Ligand binder design. Structure first.
Ligand SMILES: Nc1ncnc2c1ncn2[C@@H]1O[C@H](COP(=O)(O)OP(=O)(O)NP(=O)(O)O)[C@@H](O)[C@H]1O
Ligand SMILES: [Mg+2]
Ligand SMILES: [Zn+2]
Lengths: 639, 35, 703
DNA sequence: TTAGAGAATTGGAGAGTGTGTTTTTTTTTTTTT
């Protein structure tokens, strides 16, 4: 510790706003790099230098005020890349035991401190200036001296963008400048964003395509494409009025719930006694039920009034969504909208072609196709949002991208089912693949709507290819029949249901418009026998699982759920599959909802199926027993 | 307002939390040391 | 560990951890060692060599550092000191021990730790103004000590015997926060009823005081705020209940479940960890006097007009009243207590009574004595009680056993009790002070307590005559309304009158208006500065002790005999036997004023003059002149004797001329020592040789 | 494609250990009597 303190002191000192470097900075920095290279597996030197805050106190001032001293600048850049190395790379994984996890948290804390320090525009200004005067030279004029410096500069930017938000300070409310927002603003004011656009659009500097893709991914980490595309000049009044209206809506909901609870309990204090015998209700024994919880509770009596819920065991605990969404700063949102627009118009086709070339040549790291699929989803969604132009994404519209995404999704599906010790990670990768697939399937619909007969022709071509090949049809059933709430989040379930709805919409409209009978060595096909594959218990079980959150679901998601269930019930006559006790409890909640008028479609469907059930029950009383279990072909025996 | 200002001057003539003040006025001396 | 060239760049740390780590710790250590070794005052004298030498002379284990000097000499240490006081005070103690053992290699036999105390810290705070912002910072506060525990032993590094085996648990440090629980024995893992090893345990002195806002700084009708303070090691018994103190210490907080359940909120108890206690009474102690101070005092004593200077320095803003200034100077310096044979105690303190007219500066004299004297108690008339003056018994505030408590006379035991409006007191309150005035003790027999306390104070009282106007038609006894037992207990008895006299009125008016000019917010002999006078007084009282060899018993005996005769004749004042002992006390006081180790006839003649002039002052108008000529012709107002030295000089000159015709100053002073006329400086200032055309020079010694 | 037999992990019943508790009188003192 003390030897590190000595070298850290030997770096120099700050005075007011000017840093006075010692002449032995070079050897002291080399010694620091040597200590970091000879670290323990606990990363003790990492923790100690982070605690000493030399990155904030010495290296940033040296970088910002002595950037003409090129050997010292290069040494400082290498040292800063080493220090800003992400914790997952430092330790290899998230440790499973307390001591290494404490060390991981320490390194992560100091990384968050570095990210806080790096929001200064001066540092990114120096980085942009040195990268600019480097890239001014021709590619053939570069040597290892400059190519390695480009690598270290871009890796420093990547490392600083990668850092997770502190759990302490991630409680920022919407429309506020988080640390990531301030960092993006630093990039914007320094002009490194324009250098990233240049690197993406350059044919000569295509060697950095994977790096630039990772920078752009970490830049647009938090954003949503349609929400970002909706940003514009008049947003302040819109968002202010929306905030006031949403505040009043929340308040009215809370007042309604308070009034309902005040009615459920009486207007007498709890120690006001009184006991009743409910003569008809047998207790757990043969004696009549004695009720003690007040007369007010017997209007909506239930036996679970006083019961403690059960501990879901660790294995059965459902997966939860990893982050809340927050509306970032308006300046940063405008900057990211402009970045995304200019990038889409000037850079996107060449960058995606370069990344696909890298993946084909197999000179990319293990999971860089996840970044490729992210970029597909984000930028095609942004393109369709606002002024849709398929020329801006025509490199992505090929059937080869459908094939690549389908292969990746099936690979992630297999690896999720087999590599069980990181099944959640494989599920997240599969979620990225699913969103990319969804955006392709949405883009062909937008091509159909668009007026150009050329894009309509190619839309017909790709639709014919996809609906002809079997895997695109079978993948949805494959996903539904092995989806697990234990592993995959409800956001994934939402995306799967909406993608299935869109896919069946397109397929039904296609077959309705024209026959096109042969499919898959070909065989005949029809959409009704395809839909009969969705009559399995598991898929409808997943659909009602998503339906349980109808209060929190989006209106489009609720429409997708109810339309699929209405297709299975009304058009395929499979109401006995959906005659279930848990589903009936959900219908009971739907009918008892005070906001049931807001869910007119759902309650109407519920009353339709309930009326069918009670007709069957009046005809035959064994339907009550049939409610208790999921079924296979009892769906026809009941009929 | 010159006579009013003169009255202000006469009243100023008869006119006749601290850790931060201490640290600042000492910070000046250590800055001079470093220079 | 490389030397750190800049401590000031914290590099993102806070001061506490920054100075806790080794590099800055060693740098602070070396900087404080260098400061102690090389700091010099405005005269170039190395102050800390002198201070450490005095500390090692007196075995005091504690070193006071002036924060002003630290801030001037070494800035960053003064910067970090109030921010992280515990850490830097520990480092300072280590460095001070290194310097002390460099100066005195064998001082480890006397101490094992040197406590660095900080004084004159500018971070002064009112007790009512302490906030959470001051926590764990070095603060400075003022207040009156209202409670004190006894000096109690506290564990500092405690060792425990194991409850089963013979092993002893390691040294555990006591924290002031909670009881230290030993844990489990590492030899055998037992955790049962452990017990302290008294012989191997290290203890420290502990004393918990309660201070509150001083009653003159609190608002009227408002209740005072108070703080607990912990005094450790040689800070114990730095103060007693009633003392006004300045307290420098660390403002410290810890969790208290009792306060939490009292308030319903997680309120933390607070206490001051005292670093330096300074009584606002004793701004200068005898230990504070430097070699410069004592050199000033001793050289100033050699002026040979110092008695007039000291008299003139008593209340320099009061015109006239030379007899009052003389009496107050004699009382302020004081005599010597004596106990011949161990069986007959006689007081050494001189008591003074200023009786007279309104608007004659009696109260101003009393307030001057209050301001100048250490251990001054001021009280007034009906505001005093017998019980409050002497001593009082109360239920103890927490434990409720009867306990005796110190009154004003006990609290002034080696100081001054000032009683304004003395005639306005109740008789029952005024009779309480008889034992303290003469026997210098207060004996209480109340509620099972039977004991005598020391009350060796000097009483200076102010009074009015009957009707508020002194009457020269009557004697003092006829217009005072006090009785003989209390009148006789006052050694010096002064009458101050406000009679019309136009020239004196004009001079007094000019002096008063000049004083009001001089003191705006902005006799002949010249006085001392009051700071110098205070230093001179404490040196004269504590470092000097007069001893009486002879006093020419016949003179004083005859004086007392016929003073008794005239007192019996006129009835003006009882004389008893106390006036004789007052003569001895006043002679010792004048010797102390001159810093004499032995009393002489100069002092005896001074005391004689004071007694005779005051007794004459007690008389009526017509009687006063006859008494003046009586005691002046027969008894000793020995103003001067120039004629003997004059004719000795003339004889020596005549003999020398006769010898030379057909070193005189050495010849003159030789004859002046042979004859009992040794005070020759008076002759050299007088006119009698000058108009006879003689002269003197201490260098040439020709006359 | 469902589900059932054998092995391993997690829930919680309960056995064991340690902690906390059940108006009255005499005397002083200041002010007021
Ligand atoms: N000789 C004097 N020289 C200077 N000031 C004087 C003198 N005589 C009186 N005074 C002033 O008179 C004022 C009253 O003094 P003070 O000491 O209260 O009088 P007093 O002796 O106490 N009379 P009293 O309180 O009725 O017994 C003060 O402001 C003094 O400074
Ligand atoms: Mg007075
Ligand atoms: Zn043991």
């Amino acid at each position: 510790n003390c030897e590190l303190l000595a070298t850290c002191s030997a770096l120099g000192y700050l005075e007011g706003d000017t840093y006075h470097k010692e002449p032995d900075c070079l050897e002291s920095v080399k010694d620091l790099i040597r200590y970091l290279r000879h670290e323990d597996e606990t990363r003790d030197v990492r923790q100690q230098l982070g605690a000493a805050q030399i990155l904030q106190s010495d290296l940033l001032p040296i970088l910002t005020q002595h950037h003409q001293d090129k050997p010292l600048f290069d040494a400082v850049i290498r040292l800063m890349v080493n220090l800003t190395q992400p914790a997952l790379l430092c330790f290899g994984n998230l440790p499973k035991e307390p001591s290494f996890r404490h060390h991981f948290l320490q390194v992560l804390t100091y990384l968050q401190a570095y990210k806080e320090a790096f929001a200064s525009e001066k540092a990114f200004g120096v980085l942009s200036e040195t990268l600019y005067e480097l890239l001014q030279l021709g590619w053939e004029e570069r040597q290892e001296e400059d190519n390695l410096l480009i690598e270290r500069i871009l890796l420093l930017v990547r490392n600083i963008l990668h850092v997770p938000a502190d759990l302490d300070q991630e409680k920022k409310i919407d429309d506020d400048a988080s640390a990531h927002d301030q960092l993006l603003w630093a990039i914007h004011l320094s002009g490194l964003d324009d250098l990233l656009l240049f690197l993406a659009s350059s044919s000569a500097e295509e060697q950095w395509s994977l790096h630039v893709l990772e920078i752009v991914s970490l830049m647009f980490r938090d954003q949503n494409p349609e929400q970002l595309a909706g940003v514009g000049q008049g947003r302040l009044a819109q968002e202010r009025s929306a905030d006031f209206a949403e505040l009043e809506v929340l308040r009215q909901r809370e007042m309604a719930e308070k009034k309902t609870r005040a009615l459920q309990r009486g207007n007498r204090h709890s120690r006001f006694g009184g006991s009743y015998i409910v003569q008809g209700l047998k207790s757990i024994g043969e004696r009549d039920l004695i009720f003690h919880k007040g007369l007010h509770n017997l209007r909506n009596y239930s036996s679970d009034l006083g019961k403690q819920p059960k501990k879901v065991p660790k294995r059965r605990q459902a997966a939860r969504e990893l982050s809340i969404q927050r509306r970032s700063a308006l300046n940063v949102r405008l900057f990211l909208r402009d970045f995304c627009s200019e990038f889409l118009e000037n850079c996107y086709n060449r960058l995606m072609g370069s990344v696909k070339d890298h993946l084909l040549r197999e000179k990319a790291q293990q999971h860089d196709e996840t970044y490729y699929m992210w970029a597909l989803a984000f930028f095609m969604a942004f393109n369709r949002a606002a002024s849709f132009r398929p020329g801006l994404v025509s490199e992505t519209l090929s059937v080869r991208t459908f094939h690549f995404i389908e292969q990746n999704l099936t690979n992630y599906y297999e690896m999720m089912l087999t590599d069980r010790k990181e099944a959640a990670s494989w599920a997240r990768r599969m979620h990225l693949a699913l969103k990319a697939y969804q955006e392709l399937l949405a883009t062909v619909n937008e091509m159909d709507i668009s007026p150009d007969e050329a894009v309509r022709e190619s839309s017909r071509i790709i639709k014919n290819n996809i609906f002809y090949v079997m895997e695109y049809r079978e993948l949805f059933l494959a996903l539904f029949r092995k989806f697990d709430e234990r592993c995959q989040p409800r956001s994934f379930l939402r995306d799967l249901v909406e993608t299935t709805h869109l896919f069946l919409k397109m397929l039904e409209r296609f077959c309705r418009s024209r026959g096109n009978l042969v499919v898959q060595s070909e065989k005949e096909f029809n959409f009704l026998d395809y839909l009969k594959r969705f009559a399995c218990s598991t898929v409808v079980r997943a659909y009602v699982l998503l339906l349980r959150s109808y209060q929190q679901n989006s209106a489009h998601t609720n429409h997708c759920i109810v339309k699929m269930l209405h297709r299975l019930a009304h058009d395929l006559k499979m109401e006995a599959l959906l005659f279930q006790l848990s589903v009936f409890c959900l219908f009971n909640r739907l009918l008892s909802d005070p906001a049931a008028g807001a869910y007119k479609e759902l309650v109407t469907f519920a009353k339709y199926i309930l009326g069918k059930f009670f007709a069957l029950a009046a005809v035959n009383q064994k339907a009550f027993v049939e409610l208790l279990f999921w079924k296979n072909t009892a769906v026809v025996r009941e009929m | 307002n010159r006579e009013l200002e003169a009255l202000k001057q006469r009243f100023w003539k008869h006119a006749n939390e601290k850790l931060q003040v201490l640290k600042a006025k000492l910070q000046e001396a250590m800055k001079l040391r470093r220079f | 560990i490389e030397s750190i060239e800049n401590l000031e760049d914290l590099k993102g740390h806070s001061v506490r951890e920054w100075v806790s780590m080794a590099g800055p710790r060693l740098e602070i250590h070396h900087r404080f060692k260098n400061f102690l070794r090389t700091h010099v005052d405005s005269h170039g004298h190395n102050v800390f060599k002198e201070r450490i030498s005095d500390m090692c002379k007196e075995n005091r284990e504690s070193l006071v550092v002036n924060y002003e000097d630290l801030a001037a000499r070494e800035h960053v240490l003064a910067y970090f000191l109030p921010e992280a006081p515990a850490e830097l005070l520990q480092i300072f103690d280590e460095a001070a021990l290194e310097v002390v053992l460099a100066m005195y290699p064998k001082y480890d036999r006397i101490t094992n730790h040197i406590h660095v105390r900080i004084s004159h810290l500018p971070l002064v705070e009112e007790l009512r103004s302490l906030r959470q912002l001051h926590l764990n910072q070095l603060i400075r506060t003022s207040g009156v000590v209202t409670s004190c525990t006894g000096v109690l032993p506290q564990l500092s590094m405690v060792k425990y015997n194991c409850n089963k085996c013979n092993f002893v648990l390691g040294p555990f440090c006591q924290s002031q926060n909670q009881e230290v629980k030993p844990g489990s024995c590492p030899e055998c893992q037992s955790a049962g009823p452990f017990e302290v090893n008294m012989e191997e345990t290290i203890y420290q002195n502990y004393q918990r005081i309660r201070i509150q806002e001083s009653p003159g700084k609190v608002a009227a009708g408002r209740l005072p705020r108070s703080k607990d303070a912990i005094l450790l090691a040689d800070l114990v018994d730095s103060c007693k209940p009633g003392d006004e103190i300045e307290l420098t210490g660390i403002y410290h907080n810890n969790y208290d479940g009792s306060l939490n359940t009292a308030n319903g909120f997680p309120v933390f108890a607070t206490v001051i960890l005292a670093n330096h206690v300074a009584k606002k009474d004793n701004k200068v102690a005898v230990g504070e006097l430097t070699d410069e101070d004592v050199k000033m005092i001793t050289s100033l004593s050699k002026d040979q007009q110092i008695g007039e200077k000291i008299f003139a320095s008593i209340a320099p803003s009061i015109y006239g009243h030379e007899d009052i200034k003389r009496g107050l100077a004699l009382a302020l310096f004081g005599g010597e207590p004596k106990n011949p044979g161990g069986k007959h105690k006689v007081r050494g303190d001189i008591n003074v009574l200023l009786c007279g007219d309104p608007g004659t500066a009696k109260s101003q004299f009393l307030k001057y004595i209050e301001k100048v004297s250490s251990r001054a108690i001021f009280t007034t008339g009906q505001g005093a009680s017998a019980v409050g003056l002497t001593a009082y018994v109360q239920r103890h505030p927490v434990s409720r056993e009867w306990t005796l408590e110190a009154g004003a006379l006990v609290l002034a035991d080696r100081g001054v009790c000032l009683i304004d409006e003395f005639d306005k007191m109740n008789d029952q309150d005024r009779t309480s002070i008889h034992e303290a005035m003469e026997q210098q003790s207060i004996s209480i027999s109340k509620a099972g307590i039977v004991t005598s306390l020391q009350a060796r104070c000097t009483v200076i009282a102010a009074a009015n005559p009957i009707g508020g106007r002194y009457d020269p038609s009557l004697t003092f006894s006829e217009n005072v309304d006090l009785t003989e037992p209390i009148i006789s207990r006052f050694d010096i008895l002064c009458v101050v009158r406000d009679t019309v006299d136009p020239v004196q009125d004009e001079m007094l008016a000019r002096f008063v208006v000049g004083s009001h000019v001089r003191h705006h917010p902005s006799y002949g002999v010249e006085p001392l500065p009051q700071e110098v006078l205070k230093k001179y007084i404490i040196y004269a009282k504590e470092r000097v002790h007069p001893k009486l060899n002879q006093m020419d018993q016949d003179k004083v005996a005859k004086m007392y005999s016929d003073l008794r005769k005239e007192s019996m004749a006129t009835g003006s004042i009882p004389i008893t036997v106390r006036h004789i002992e007052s003569m001895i006390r006043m002679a010792e006081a004048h010797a102390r004023i001159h810093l004499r180790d032995y009393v002489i006839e100069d002092d005896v003649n001074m005391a004689i003059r004071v007694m005779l002039e005051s007794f004459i002052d007690t008389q009526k108008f017509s009687v006063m002149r006859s008494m003046r000529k009586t005691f002046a012709r027969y008894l000793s107002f020995r103003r001067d004797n120039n004629e003997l030295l004059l004719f000795i000089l003339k004889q020596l000159v005549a003999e020398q001329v006769t010898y030379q015709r057909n070193v005189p100053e050495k010849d003159l002073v030789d004859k002046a020592r042979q004859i009992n006329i040794h005070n020759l400086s008076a002759f050299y200032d007088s006119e009698l040789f000058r108009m006879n055309k003689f002269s003197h020079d201490l260098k040439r010694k020709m006359i």
